[PDB]
Amino acid sequence: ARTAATAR
Amino acid sequence: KVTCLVCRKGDNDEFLLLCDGCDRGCHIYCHRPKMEAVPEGDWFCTVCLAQQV
Ligand SMILES: [Zn+2]
Ligand SMILES: [Zn+2]
């Protein structure tokens, strides 16, 4: 999974 | 624009886990049971779990 930081 | 399902805030985005089935999110530190880190595999929120069969 990913985070809102790693996405944007 | 993602906010956490538990606390309703979008702060600390390095801890703010994103659902792989929808636009929803959750801080790892708000999760119960304990989630010490962002998982490598897919994570599904409770709304998405409710759609499974
Ligand atoms: Zn939270
Ligand atoms: Zn979801």
The domains found in chain B, sorted by start residue, are 1-53 (3.30.40.10)
B16's tokens: 């703010």
Ligand 2 ion: Cβ-proximal residues, 5 Å cutoff: B 19, 21-22, 24, 45, 48
Q: Which residues of A touch B20 (CB under 8 A)?
A: 1
Cis before B33? omega within 30 = yes
Neighbouring residues of B32: CB distance < 8 A, sequence distance ≥ 6: none
Breaks (C-N over 2.5 A) in chain A follow: none
From residue B38, alpha-carbon distances to B24, B26, B42 in Å are: 15, 10, 10
Cα angle at B1 between A5 and B4, to 5 degrees? 75
